[PDB]
From a paper:
Nucleoside diphosphate kinases (NDPKs) catalyze the reversible transfer of the phosphoryl γ of nucleoside triphosphates to nucleoside diphosphates. The two-step reaction proceeds via a covalent intermediate, the enzyme being transiently phosphorylated on a conserved histidine residue, His117 in Mycobacterium tuberculosis NDPK (Mt-NDPK). Crystal structure of the Mt-NDPK has been solved. It is a hexamer with a tertiary and quaternary structure very similar to other hexameric NDPKs.
Residue numbers in the entry:
A (entry chain A), B (entry chain A), C (entry chain A), D (entry chain A), E (entry chain A), F (entry chain A): 2 to 136
The structure:
Amino acid sequence: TERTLVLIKPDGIERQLIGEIISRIERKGLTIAALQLRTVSAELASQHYAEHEGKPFFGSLLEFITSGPVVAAIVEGTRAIAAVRQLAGGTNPVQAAAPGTIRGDFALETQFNLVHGSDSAESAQREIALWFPGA
Amino acid sequence: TERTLVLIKPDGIERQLIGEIISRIERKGLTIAALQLRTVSAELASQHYAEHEGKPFFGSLLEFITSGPVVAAIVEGTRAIAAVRQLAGGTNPVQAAAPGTIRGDFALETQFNLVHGSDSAESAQREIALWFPGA
Amino acid sequence: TERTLVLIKPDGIERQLIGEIISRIERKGLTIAALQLRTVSAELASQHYAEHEGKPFFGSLLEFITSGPVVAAIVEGTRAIAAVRQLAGGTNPVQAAAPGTIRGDFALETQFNLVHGSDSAESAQREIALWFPGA
Amino acid sequence: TERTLVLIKPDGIERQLIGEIISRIERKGLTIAALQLRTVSAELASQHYAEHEGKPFFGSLLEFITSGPVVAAIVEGTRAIAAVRQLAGGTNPVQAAAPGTIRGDFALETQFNLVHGSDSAESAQREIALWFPGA
Amino acid sequence: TERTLVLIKPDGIERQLIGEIISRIERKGLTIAALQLRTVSAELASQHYAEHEGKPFFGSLLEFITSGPVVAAIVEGTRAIAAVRQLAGGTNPVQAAAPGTIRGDFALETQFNLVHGSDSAESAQREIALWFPGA
Amino acid sequence: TERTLVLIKPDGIERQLIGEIISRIERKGLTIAALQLRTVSAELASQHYAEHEGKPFFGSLLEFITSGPVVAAIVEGTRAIAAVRQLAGGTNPVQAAAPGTIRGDFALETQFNLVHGSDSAESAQREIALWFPGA
């Protein structure tokens, strides 16, 4: 079994999809190991987005994650990592994401993607330590 | 943002899926700009199906759209055109349409496809003028 | 069988519940006889609210129905009138409306009631003539 | 607007209803002000259940809340208190709770009630201070 | 724990509600102990409806249960009997049944009630022996 | 129109998905021709899994199908065979099955696949004779 970090971003909250997203995870058979509505410091935001740190969309990327609170969580279970990304869909909700996924069903813009899921074991271990340093 | 024409055909109505379809559109983040249950004249039907005007399935194609009332609508929003076709699925509901789409979830026959969505900007502009000449 | 007028007010639209409401109606076994997204003139609004014409909440009552478009419809079927009001719930969504109803599930304020349904045969016949004078 | 404390108890979690419950809250128009999966100390449990402190069911009442983690939350909005209790249903899910409520739809036992909601302004203010002393 | 007999009548099947009904039962926490789509002999129908044997609606009552196949089942769990009747709603779907129940959400006529649930321990034991004499 | 055999395996039952699965079938427009919760003899299990009779996973394959009761059914309609497999998804729920399918939405393991659907006309005719020799 694996552990992956999941974020429900400020747009997912504005659109009232916290429970919808969590439900899909639960229904897949995965288990919520940690869960917390929290605010994001300027520091955390950048450390999170270091992969795309130096790039054209960095600015508004941080301003976004910091505009309102977010819901962070540790999702655990068999193939947690791949499964979550499976539920989430591709980055582009119209041309990439399949219908039935979170982004595929609710999203229209690459930017406002509603959700985040660790893209690899390497990332997951790094992001969990980052958002849930205690646990 | 774009505007696209959407039809909920007589079979979509017989099967009580008006609200189900509209909901999926709404949930995607798209907005219903126009909406009307209406009947179809012989003329409108053919002007609509002019693309496939001369073909083997034209007859019953018109007889169908004219058998009962239909629900016409203008759907507006970011990438309205592609998104709607994304929600609708491919023409063949079993071999083409993905599960999660409208046709993929409810349809079994290429003919009885429940729904219509403009396939391009060129078409949308033409079909909207056709169904909602005022608006 | 009966005919009743149903309104999905501007708040029902802002909250993306057109399809949700229509679906509940469909699922009850009732049939959408007429349906149209339309704007409301100052005149229509008052003629509609004549029952509560002279009262303390009249002003903002009209300003509301006229702030954005609404979805009007004629719902037909066995006991259409009572059934629709059954689905809609009592006027106060928290103290009157039962869970499971439209207002009971989605509403919090007596004012923002999302929906309207004719309260009697007398009213229905009057309101249908008013909103769908042709049909 | 009001603030009320909501608990999703260990049975609500075992039965995979976190998102289902949160969704119902969201859909009612209420907003999640705080949210956290957390464990319960022996002390917190009793301070929470002081109202029924001296009684026949106290023992297993505490042992339960402490058997696994729970999801605590602050729910905010118009009539937050009454509305939440409205969504939750009466204590007895079969004879009291109406269909459509959380308990009414999912529960069978008075003990395993899935959810908790502050029963009054007095309680809410006390329980929020208790579970979210910071916020 | 108790055992109760549940019938999904021919109208429940025509309206594609087998899974919807079963789901509601499952979700309540009850368990399907037996389940079978079967036809009804003239004899079984009357033995079932002996309570209302001599009455004005007996004829079409039997003709109905015998018009198409039905889905019979034994539902088991805590307060199975009351809970099932709770999910089913009162006999009259508009004036008696609450929204959120099966009849309350889908039915319009006292006759076409979609579902049946044993009304008492005495009945349950009698009807189970009748429909599932082996089990 | 075609006939296909569908199994809801013991894990589909443990996870309370009987009605969910049946519903998806119904909603696709397919019809339940036969349906029965039943136990599986050692013989039936192997005759069913003869295709993969001689293989590394045979043992626990039979032990599984025989651990608890299962729900067998004959599903009938246009392209019943392909459609059902379409609803079910690929064998591997994470890497193969698309979101929106049964396995895609609920499953995490190739072994615990919740459902079975005949993979061909040849198989269907053979498996129906096997599970429903009378009908």
